[model samples]
Target chain A: MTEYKLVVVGAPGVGKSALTIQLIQNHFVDEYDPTIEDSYRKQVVIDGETCLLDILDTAGQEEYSAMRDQYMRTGEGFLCVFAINNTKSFEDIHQYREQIKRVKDSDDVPMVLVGNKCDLAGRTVESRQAQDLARSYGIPYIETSAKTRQGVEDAFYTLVREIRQH
Target chain B: MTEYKLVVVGAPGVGKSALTIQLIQNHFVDEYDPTIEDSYRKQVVIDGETCLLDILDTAGQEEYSAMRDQYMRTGEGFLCVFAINNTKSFEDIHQYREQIKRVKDSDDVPMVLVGNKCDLAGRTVESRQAQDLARSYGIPYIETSAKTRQGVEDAFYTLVREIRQH
Candidate 1:
């Protein structure tokens, strides 16, 4: 079976934990709790290919921030996330992508851009801009509403495929 | 003179580091380095009142994103920042504000909505929108350029005053 390690990251309150939880366990958390870095393993079949995935759900707070480097070093792919309603979170992905490249020492690291909280109204970060940003990074862009369970699985499944391809 | 603990936060590449660095050291760093956490203290004269400000510049990355909660627990005021050039960073400030309120257990907390990198053109987030959002939260909104040091001192000075008043 193919095995892959993926890391999820974004600013605090960007619904990173919610998206990760919905993907791994199929449930959305209404209340936001700061994550402390949890790893989930699952056997998933994508495109009729069986593979085992290990995901690291990272915290978006200052206390546990030191541990992110270790996660980056171990992970094979990344889910660089932001909330559609929250523009700053989207702006920060530029640094996230750079860190991955620096840690991996390669620009070819497989990544998927995730825009969460699509269920919320008054969207500030448009899909076109996000898609443009993703294209500039040479990665895939996906919009997901963890609360509505929209594109949650596809974010991970697509990343898994990206990881497999590279 | 009152001492205040102010925390600066936003997503990676949103100019938090640059803003904080300029405020404390009066300099700008062109390259982005993922911060773990950095604390700076200065005797700032705000409105002819000399007070010591302890500013915690929080990291904006997946590795150290967990460390933010501890800062929130101890912070008296927050400079929830975003870059004017990046609209996503502006949208994400809502979560930072929400998390601060949730952790502090009060709707009332001393915070300033900062739009950094105002020196750059082609702004994605409008000043009027950011001002309106800040007013809705009943907080002060300020535009800053870490590169040119515009509104950097005023951002902290105003927040310090807000902290003192509350």
Candidate 2:
């Protein structure tokens, strides 16, 4: 049983669920609610490998301290994300990393930095300078469009490799 | 008293505070909380102009019914952001358009698209295919690194131009 702990973490409304849903069922959170008060999760299979994704869908709101702790304390392989349409999320990830350290038990948890929603380039307006930030943190970063599945595999696969290797 | 309601409206944790703090106080949220319960706002200045920027930092949690109404009744210029580092967010902005329209009182509010955190690109492992969304939205979109201030000016200054012109 090759269980992968692919934690899809990000600021609220950055399309974590959408990406997850898309990967699982090709669905998007077009009108779905934000983070679940209790983290929601599921699993998937790719290349004959049953990847059990224990996704700790953490809240993006400030009041969910306990919830944050719950996810951070045990979650592994963080899929840190924000929207390519929103530039601020890129920096927010740095804040999240601090929290990740606080919540996790180790210092070197594998993280795959993700810039979601590149499907809206013409109307994306905000440009996420993906490469520079990745270098700054010395972490693997990638731009993905959950809607179109662009870079989706790259972001997830990269995390898989790091988590599996680490 | 030149005061415009400058709303830092983006998905949760897009460095809205970092950019806000960085531009105003030359500081950053090293471990800032993502989104709070209620929207807390403040005032600021630009180019020696004392502008009343109602920086309403809204919670991007799952519970958005009341939050949406609060912002709807008062939001003006939205600093909409997506992390190019996380791409799924760009795909979500359009889906949240209804909430944006309902919460926004103005028929036409100037929205500046921001792709934050260019300072972390070296670790980026993937890229996207196009720029179609920004064009469709008719908003000025750019990338910003509050840490580097790469495209910060373009993200906000473009809105200043729209306000000045209008």
Output the number of the lDDT-best candidate: 1
B126 Cα displacement, candidate 1 (Å): 54
Against the native complex, each candidate's DockQ, computed on alpha carbons, is 0.01, 0.01
Tens digits of per-residue lDDT, candidate 2, B98-153, equal 56666664446667666677567542212121123444565544556888765554
lDDT for model 2 comes to 0.62
Candidate 1 deviant stretches above 4 angstroms: B1-166
RMSD of 1: 21.5
Residue lDDT tens for model 1, B1-166: 5688999989788988888888788889998587878889888644223578898988766576567677898999999999888988888888788888888999999888888888786888877688668768877677778898877776776576567546
TM-score of 2: 0.46
Overall local distance difference test of candidate 1? 0.79
TM-score of chain B of each: 0.94, 0.78
Chain A (alone) TM-scores for all candidate structures: 0.95, 0.84
CA error at residue B157 for candidate 1, angstroms: 50
lDDT for A72 in candidate 1 is 89
